[PDB]
A paper describes a structure:
Here, we describe the crystal structure and enzymatic properties of Xyl2, a novel GH11 endo-β-1,4-xylanase from the pathogenic fungus F. oxysporum that also exhibits a synergic β-d-xylosidase activity. Overall, Xyl2 folds into the characteristic GH11 xylanase fold consisting of a highly twisted β-sandwich core that comprises 14 β-strands and is further stabilized by a single α-helix in the opposite side of the active site. The groove delimited by the long β-hairpin, commonly denominated the “thumb” region, and the curved side of the β-sandwich or “fingers” region defines a long, wide valley into which the xylan substrate molecule binds, or “palm” region. The general mechanism of glycoside hydrolases (GH) starts with the nucleophilic attack by a carboxylate nucleophile (Glu176 side chain) on the anomeric carbon of the scissile glycosidic bond, resulting in the release of the linked sugar residue and the formation of a covalent enzyme–sugar intermediate.
The crystal structure of Xyl2 at 1.56 Å has revealed an atomic-level view of the active-site groove from which the catalytic mechanism can be inferred. The final model contains the complete amino acid sequence except for the first and last amino acids (residues 2-190). The N-terminus of Xyl2, however, adopts a particular conformation and, instead of running away from the active site, it folds into an elongated motif that forms one side of the active-site groove. Since the position and orientation of this unique feature appear to complete the fingers in Xyl2, we propose to call this unique feature the “pinky” motif. Besides Tyr76, the residues in the active site from the palm region (Tyr179, Gln136, Arg121 and Asn70) are fully conserved across GH11 xylanases and entirely defined in the electron density map at 1.56 Å contoured at 1σ level. Comparison of the Xyl2/MBX and the unliganded Xyl2 active-site structures revealed that, in the unliganded Xyl2, a glycerol molecule from the cryoprotectant solution was found in the active site near to the position occupied by MBX ligand. The glycerol molecule is stabilized by interactions with the side chains of the catalytic residues Tyr87, Arg121 and Gln135, and is well defined in the electron density map, which reinforces the view that Xyl2 active site is particularly capable of binding xylose and chemically related molecules situated at position-2, the position of the xylene subunit immediately adjacent to the β-(1,4) glycosidic bond to be hydrolyzed. In the observed conformations, Glu176 side chain points to the bulk solvent, which causes the side chain of Tyr72 to concertedly flip over to a less hindered conformation. The present structure confirms the poor activity for Xyl2 at this pH since it presents a concerted change in the Glu176 and Tyr72 rotamers, with the nucleophilic Glu176 side chain being kept away from the substrate.
Residue numbers in the entry: 2 to 190
The structure:
């Protein structure tokens, strides 16, 4: 029902999705800059990056302030197989990987990441209502700026049998779910 607003800004791909537009303000700034402010009802996800994604190093910085269900993550999809993946850098009052099956750990970029897989059934995807897996790398030491070696995560996932398909988009995403929060982030390489 609800398509993400997508396009280009500042030399980056961007995607912004919400099922409740009046609850959220998403703004594209210059270069890799974007901001999101949300509160009250609804599910909101937005950010800037690359279409398609690859094993690139992603640098980011800025301010991320969650007040409830929320995450800051490198966020992307693959196809064949259909995979929604997350490299979670920060989050609020609730670990988004909750209920994921833990597959291992990876030490990269100055922290250990816990690796999980979950299945989502009959859910929205880059290919409509589908059943797909979610891959999670969740940073134990939360942060709001730094560098993410996505290839190191992809390889770590592979080493525990979480194989990826062909890349679709890859963004630095800020997400809120029936919560409040705000962020002002800048992506780069």
């Amino acid at each position: 029902r609800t398509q993400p607003t997508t396009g280009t800004s500042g030399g980056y791909y961007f995607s912004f999705w919400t099922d409740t537009p009046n609850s959220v303000t998403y703004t594209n700034g210059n270069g890799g800059q974007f901001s999101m402010q949300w509160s009250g009802n609804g599910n909101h996800v937005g950010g800037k990056g690359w279409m398609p994604g690859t094993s690139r190093t992603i640098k980011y910085s800025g301010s991320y302030n969650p007040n409830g269900n929320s995450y800051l993550a490198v966020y992307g999809w693959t196809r064949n197989p259909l995979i929604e993946y997350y490299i979670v850098e920060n989050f609020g009052t609730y670990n988004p990987s909750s209920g994921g099956q833990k597959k291992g750990e990876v030490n990269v970029d100055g922290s250990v990441y816990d690796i999980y897989v979950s299945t989502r059934v009959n859910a929205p995807s880059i290919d409509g209502n589908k059943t797909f897996q979610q891959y999670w790398s969740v940073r134990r030491n939360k942060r709001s700026s730094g560098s993410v070696n996505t290839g190191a995560h992809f390889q770590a996932w592979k080493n525990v049998g979480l194989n990826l398909g062909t890349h679709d988009y890859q963004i630095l995403a800020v997400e809120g779910y029936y919560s409040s929060g705000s962020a002002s982030m800048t992506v780069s390489q």
